[PDB]
Amino acid sequence: GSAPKYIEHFSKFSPSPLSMKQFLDFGSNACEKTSFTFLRQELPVRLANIMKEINLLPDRVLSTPSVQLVQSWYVQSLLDIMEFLDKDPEDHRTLSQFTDALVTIRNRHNDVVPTMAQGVLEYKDTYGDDPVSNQNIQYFLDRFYLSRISIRMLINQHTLIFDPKHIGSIDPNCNVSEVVKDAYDMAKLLCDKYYMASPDLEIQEINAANSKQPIHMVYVPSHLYHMLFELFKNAMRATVESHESSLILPPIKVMVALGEEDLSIKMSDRGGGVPLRKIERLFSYMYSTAPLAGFGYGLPISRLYAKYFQGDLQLFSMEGFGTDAVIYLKALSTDSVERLPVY
Ligand SMILES: Cc1cnc(Cl)nc1-c1ccc(N(Cc2ccc(CN3CCCC3)cc2)C(=O)c2ccc(O)cc2O)cc1
Ligand SMILES: CC(C)c1ccc(COc2ccc(CC(=O)NCCN)cc2Cl)cc1
Ligand SMILES: [Cl-]
Ligand SMILES: [Cl-]
């Protein structure tokens, strides 16, 4: 076969990060031909850059089953997309079978998260959980997962639009507070199910420049929902379990602030907090892997969604009181550009 030749060829290119504007323009919308000619080049590039990094893991990680399995999905996926390079953009049947091909590739990779987690596990028992192993797992999986978020983004934008308000998974007029309440409502529903007490919500907006206007942005609301959901679930558990022997149950307070460049979402809880020394481990794939806890993408992945369009997600706590979690997002669509791992 040709996979090592392909990987090698296409890893010579750099991925091309897109901005919200580039994304919106792809989606308003007859330029299917153009998304196709873009993607049949860009996907192999992104696949091959990440595939190259996987193949440079030491052989005692690389030869484990979990990694072999995902390596075979990547090989197959890239091969699926090769078939279209010499194919004819004008032939409407080329276009339809390429969409079929993206969906098949999306389904194929759906279970990477639990697959990789078996690899982390196997490595922990098999070679240990020393700080140096931790940094390497961190470094690799943040890049692997960021890369994966970016590919799904490309693919979702194509299949949603080439099957008037929403542009695939981008909402150009996303009402942040609305996404906050929806994620609260959903986490409350689970909290009430498993704990039979749930905090309330207080939302406060601060629109610095337009004191009274509701706060809107261009964003991917499913991502924002993922992050808000994981935060609510954590804050609820902290709040509820820490106030079991007490009657008052503090609310979870969220502030949504709009600056000139940041759009910031703080979620404040009175769950008793975490000492400073234990905070980093909440972002560690390795320390948060062991053979309400069932729901959510997790902290480390929620931070990647934030980073993905040049934002961040940070935690700061006061042991004995509670924790603030903040999502930092870029306010302006012009500063929202894909952040892709640097190969
Ligand atoms: C990471 C995670 C994943 N899945 C779920 Cl279900 N829970 C968490 C999670 C982890 C840490 C936290 N802790 C520490 C904590 C505080 C209070 C209790 C309750 N005690 C515990 C002993 C007695 C009552 C337990 C733990 C936070 O301080 C915290 C972290 C992130 C966060 O976003 C918000 C937070 O409040 C909160 C949630
Ligand atoms: C995500 C899964 C697949 C996973 C599981 C485990 C790992 C671990 O990867 C390690 C572990 C230790 C070291 C230090 C070292 O001794 N390097 C020498 C290299 N021979 C380097 C790397 Cl790349 C990565 C990814
Ligand atoms: Cl990163
Ligand atoms: Cl932090």
The atom number, within ligand 1, closest to the CA of 282 reads: 1
Residues near ligand 1 with C-beta < 6 Å? 231, 233-235, 237-238, 241-242, 269, 271-274, 282, 292-293, 299, 315, 317, 322-323, 325
What phi, psi does 198 have (nearest 5°)? Answer: -145, 140
- Other CB atoms within 10 A of residue 244 CB: 9
Active site residues: 226, 230, 233-234
- Other CB atoms within 10 A of residue 177 CB: 17
Ligand 4 centre from 109 Cα, in Å? 29
Helix 299-308 vs helix 221-242: crossing angle, to nearest 10:
150
- From the CB of 132, is ligand 2 less than 6 Å away? yes
For the chain, domains (ranges, CATH) are 1-167 (1.20.140.20), 168-339 (3.30.565.10)
What is the residue with the minimal CA distance to atom 18 of ligand 1?
Answer: 238
Instruction: Reduce the secondary structure of the chain to three states and give it as a string.
Output: CCHHHHHHHHCCCCCCCCEHHHHHHHCCCCCHHHHHHHHHHHHHHHHHHHHHHHHCCCHHHHCCHHHHHHHHHHHHHHHHHHCCCCCCCCCHHHHHHHHHHHHHHHHHCCCHHHHHHHHHHHHHHHHCCCHHHHHHHHHHHHHHHHHHHHHHHHHHHHHHHCCCCCECCEEEEEEHHHHHHHHHHHHHHHHHHHHCCCCCEEEEEEECCCCCCCCEEEECHHHHHHHHHHHHHHHHHHHHHHCCCCCCCCCEEEEEEECCCEEEEEEECCCCCCCHHHHHHHHCCCCCCCCCCCCCCCHHHHHHHHHHCCCEEEEEEECCCEEEEEEEEECCHHHCECCCCCC
Please give the Cα distance from 121 to 123 (Å, whole number). Answer: 5
The atom number, within ligand 1, closest to the CA of 325 reads: 33
- From the CB of 119, is ligand 2 less than 6 Å away? yes
CA angle 329, 330, 334 (to 5 degrees): 150
Structure tokens at 38: 């873009």
As residues whose CB is below 5 A from the ion ligand 3, the structure lists 142
What phi, psi does 297 have (nearest 5°)? Answer: -80, -20
Structure tokens at 174: 């996303």
Place of tokens 């020393």: 130
Nearest to 314, CA basis, from 270, 271, 262, 272? 262
Ligand 1 centre from 302 Cα, in Å? 15
Substitution site in 245, 282, 292, 318 for ligand 1 pocket (most atoms within 8 Å of beta carbon):
282
Structure tokens at 86: 């010499």
User: Which experimental technique did the depositors report for determining this structure?
Assistant: X-ray
